[PDB]
Design a protein around this ligand. Structure first.
Ligand code: ZAN
Ligand code: CL
Ligand code: CL
Ligand code: CL
Ligand code: MG
Ligand code: MG
Ligand code: NA
Length: 326
DNA sequence: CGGCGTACG
DNA sequence: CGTA
DNA sequence: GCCG
């Protein structure tokens, strides 16, 4: 088992679901406390279990697995022995965890804002609605739409949204294309949002595109919330039988020269990309982002025509999106 | 011990 | 600060 | 919290 998540296939569904879920509770709680290092180790240990070919049934099967030391092994041991880990259950029922989860789930609220509100004594969404002076426009929208945004986006919803975006994109710039990215491209059947990547086959024609797209979607009455730009984090009005629901949609524009890097970056998973960028820098001495891959010795950028090119550049076996579910 | 992804709005 |  |  290699040490980086980008070195091994990780399927969406696997054989250690309960164990990985428990470790990811501890990772999430670490993040709520600002402990980024412990968050990473618990995320990585969870991801290792996702990549295994069969269930862990005995503690000895953790020997030699990367990112399993005393703490993560004890968590697994307790789950195997008793079906529950006391530390995990204590986190789950704690007021701190439940409120930080509730607050950081709001669009426009991160850990730092959630934590300040927690320390001020705030605990519920209605607590926030009662003091709207303390809210940004973005947070106001996130709170108004919170119930709809808490409902999973279905793969069956994605196709309708993509046609709508393609219509506006085609008027904004004929020939521009729309590619589904994010979790749905990795095979997920549900999501928290829909992520789209937009480009044009003629380098440079994509300049200034996203304002033109957003103006057209807004004119069609489809935009419940949005903020020159190349990323847009929106709330869309999605038709439903006899009504509609609010859905988060992310739009990103990239020039075609950067499209493989942007596709790779925006297809995720989040942990897969962090691990990939960590691997690139630490093992290969190359700097990776959603725009390119930089050699800081030669001061040159790698040209890539595909995701396959990028994996080859980095000396990694290619993983299709369905195996990037780290 | 230092390191832990990397951008844009 | 938020967001991907 | 774990790796190197
Ligand atoms: N913090 C991050 N660091 C690096 N890449 C990230 C980060 N957040 C998001 N991304 C990239 O943006 C993609 C879309 O982000 P999302 O926040 O939309 N997560 P996604 O994988 O789509 O699952 P859902 O919760 O939406 O169902 C991710 O899959 C990553 O490729
Ligand atoms: Cl470029
Ligand atoms: Cl590609
Ligand atoms: Cl980036
Ligand atoms: Mg998504
Ligand atoms: Mg998104
Ligand atoms: Na949030």
């Amino acid at each position: 088992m290699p040490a980086y998540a980008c070195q091994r296939p990780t399927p969406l569904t696997h054989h250690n679901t309960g164990l990985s879920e428990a470790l990811e509770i501890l990772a999430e709680a670490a993040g709520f406390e600002g402990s980024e290092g412990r968050l990473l180790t618990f995320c990585r240990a969870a991801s290792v279990l996702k990549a295994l070919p069969s269930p862990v049934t005995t503690l000895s099967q953790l020997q030699g697995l990367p990112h399993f030391g005393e703490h993560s092994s004890r968590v697994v041991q307790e789950l195997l022995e008793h079906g529950v880990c006391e530390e995990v259950e204590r986190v789950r029922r704690s007021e701190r965890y439940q409120t930080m989860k509730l607050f950081t789930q709001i669009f426009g609220v991160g850990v730092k804002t959630a934590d300040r509100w927690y320390r001020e004594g705030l605990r519920t969404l209605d607590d926030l609605r009662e003091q709207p002076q303390k809210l940004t426009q973005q947070q106001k929208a996130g709170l108004q739409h919170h119930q709809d945004l808490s409902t999973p986006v279905l793969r069956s919803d994605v196709d309708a949204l993509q046609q709508v975006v393609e219509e506006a994109v085609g008027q904004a710039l004929p020939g521009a294309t729309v590619t589904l990215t994010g979790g749905f491209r990795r095979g997920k059947l549900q999501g928290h949002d829909v992520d789209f990547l937009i480009t044009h086959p003629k380098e440079g024609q994509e300049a200034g595109l996203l304002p033109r797209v957003m103006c057209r979607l807004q004119d069609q009455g489809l935009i419940l919330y949005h903020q020159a730009f190349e990323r847009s984090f929106c709330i869309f009005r999605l038709p439903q039988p006899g009504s509609w629901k609010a859905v988060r949609v992310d739009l990103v524009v990239a020039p075609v020269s950067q499209f493989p890097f942007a596709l790779l970056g925006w297809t995720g998973s989040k942990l897969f990309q962090r691990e990939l960028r960590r691997f690139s820098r630490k093992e290969k001495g190359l700097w990776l982002n959603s725009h390119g891959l930089f050699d800081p010795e030669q001061k040159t950028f790698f040209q890539a025509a595909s995701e396959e090119d990028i994996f080859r550049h980095l000396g990694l076996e290619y993983l299709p999106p369905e195996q990037r579910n780290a």
